[PDB]
Chain A
Amino acid sequence: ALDMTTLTIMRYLPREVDPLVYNMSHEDPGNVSYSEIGGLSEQIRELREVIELPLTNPELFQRVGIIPPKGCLLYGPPGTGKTLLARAVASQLDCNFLKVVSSSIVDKYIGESARLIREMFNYARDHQPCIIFMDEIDAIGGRRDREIQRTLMELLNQMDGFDTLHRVKMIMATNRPDTLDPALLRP
C-alpha cells in the first residue's frame, strides 16, 4: 500500500484474492458422495488416486520419489457425470476447492484473462491444499480469438510452474476433447 502524497510504502498487504477467485472457491458444490455417483468405479478410483491420494497422503509420494501427476482431464459424452464426479470430489474432501466455467474467465479487457488465471493459481498456491476444477476447458484449450491463445499460453506457463511440493491439483472437463490443442495433451 502506498501513500497518496509521497507514495512511500506502508502496510504491505499479504496478497489479493481477486474476488472472482473468492466466488469460485466459496461456491456450493453439493453434498454429493461417491455413493451417489455410480457406474464409474474404475474412473472414481483413478481420479481419487490422481487427485485425492497425492493431496491427503503425500509422504508416500515424496519418500518413494514419484512426482504426483499435476492434473487430470475428463472427457466423454454429455451427461456422463464428469461434472458430477468433480462435484463429489469437491464435496467429500475437506479442502479448498476452485471451480470456474472456462467461458467466464475470458474478459473483454486487454490481457485481463491472463492476470485472472495467474491470480487463480497464486491463490491456489497460497491456500493449499487447494483444488482447481476446469469445466468446458475447450473454451480456451482449443486448437490455435487472439486473447484465447494469449491466455492459453499463460495457462501452459502457469501450470508448468507447479513445483513438486505444492498440494494443488487440476481437473479439466470437456465434451469435445478433439478440439483441445495438443499442447495440453503433452506429458
Chain B
Amino acid sequence: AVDTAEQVYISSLALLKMLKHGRAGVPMEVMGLMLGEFVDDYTVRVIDVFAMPQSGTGVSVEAVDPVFQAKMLDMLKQTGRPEMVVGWYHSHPGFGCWLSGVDINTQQSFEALSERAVAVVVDPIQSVKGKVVIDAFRLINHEPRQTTSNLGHLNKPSIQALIHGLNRHYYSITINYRKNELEQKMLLNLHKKSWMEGLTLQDYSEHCKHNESVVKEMLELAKNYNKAVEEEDKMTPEKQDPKRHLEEHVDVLMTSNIVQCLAAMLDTVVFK
C-alpha cells in the first residue's frame, strides 16, 4: 500500500562503515550498498554495509559492478550474512545531504529493482566534531505519503535539500540507530579510562604552573569584580566578565587541586 512516516534503522557497524568509506573517498564521491531486511511497511532495517570499487564514472548506476556485487553477496552468504540488499549510500563532501539529478535516477533504478530501496547521503567532511550529517531519501511516483502518525514531524528538514528537492522529487525518511547493549560499552572501551590513568598523579611541576596561572587570572578577574561591585548604583539597569568567569575559575582550580591532593594521598598510603 501507500507508504507512511516510516523509519530506517541502521546499525553501528553500518554507520561506521559508511563514515569510514566516505572519509576515505573525499574529495571524490564514493558509493556502496547496505544489506538489510524489509521487516515491514513502517520501517526498513539495514545491517552491515559494503563499499564497492570507485570507477571513473563517478556515483552512477554504471559505477555498480554487477560481478563485484554478485560475488560479494555470494561470499557474504557463505560467511554467514544472507542479508538481501536494499539501500545504497553515497558521499557528498563539501555540500549537504540531498539527491542530485544523477542520484534521482540511480535511486529510480534501485527502486525499480526491489520497490522500497532507500537512498542514503553522507557528507564525510561535514560529519565531524560529533555531528553526523546523514540522511535517507526515497522517490515519489497529490499525496506524497500517508501521515498516520506524529513520528514524521519530530524532525525538521533543511533548506539545502529543500531547494534540491527534499520534498519536491524525493522525500527524506527519519533515520534511527539500532545500537544494542553489547555494542554499547564495547565501543566505550575506546575512551574508557584505564585504572593506571585513574591513579596517575599528573605532573607536579605542571600542576604548580597551572595553579600559578589560574590564581593570577583569579587576581585579574577580582580586580574588575571590585569595580563591578563598586558600580552597584543601578544606572540604566542592564553576563560578561567578572562573576561567572570567577565562578568557572574557582570551580576548575578547586577540583584540580582536590583531585591532585586525593590522588597523591591515595598513592602515598596504598602503594606502600
Contacts and interface: CB of A to CB of B under 8 A. Distances in A.
B263 interface: no
Interface string A1-41: 00011100000000000000000000000000000000000
Contacts of B124: 5
A32 B127 CA distance: 64
Nearest to A3: B26
B125 interface: yes
Contacts of B26: 4-5
B128 A6 contact: yes
Contacts of B23: 5
Nearest to A4: B27
A5 B127 CA distance: 11
B32 interface: no
Main secondary structure of the interface of B (DSSP, over half): loop
Contacts of B128: 6
A151 B256 CA distance: 56
B92 to A, nearest CB: 13
A6 B125 CA distance: 7
Interface residues of A, number: 3
Interface string B88-125: 00000100000000000000000000000000000011
A4 B26 CA distance: 8
Contacts of A4: 26-27
A4 B28 CA distance: 11
Interface string B1-38: 00000000000000000000001001100000000000
Contacts of A5: 23, 26-27, 93, 124-125
A98 B125 CA distance: 44
B89 to A, nearest CB: 18
Contacts of B27: 4-5
A11 to B, nearest CB: 18
A5 B125 CA distance: 6
Nearest to B23: A5
A7 to B, nearest CB: 10
Contacts of A6: 125, 128
B127 to A, nearest CB: 11
B132 to A, nearest CB: 15
Interface in A98-148: none
A4 B93 CA distance: 10
Nearest to A6: B128
A36 to B, nearest CB: 56
Interface string B115-148: 0000000001100100000000000000000000
Nearest to B125: A5
A4 to B, nearest CB: 6
A10 to B, nearest CB: 15
A5 B126 CA distance: 9
B23 to A, nearest CB: 6
A104 B23 CA distance: 44
A5 B27 CA distance: 8
Interface string B144-156: 0000000000000
A158 B47 CA distance: 63
Interface string A63-90: 0000000000000000000000000000
Nearest to B26: A5
B27 to A, nearest CB: 6
A1 B83 CA distance: 43
A5 B26 CA distance: 7
A3 to B, nearest CB: 9
Interface of A: 4-6
Sort A-B residue pairs by CB-CB distance and give the 3 closest, nearest first: A5-B26, A5-B125, A4-B27
10 contacts: A4-B26, A4-B27, A5-B23, A5-B26, A5-B27, A5-B93, A5-B124, A5-B125, A6-B125, A6-B128
Given A5-B23, A5-B124, 8 more contacts: A4-B26, A4-B27, A5-B26, A5-B27, A5-B93, A5-B125, A6-B125, A6-B128
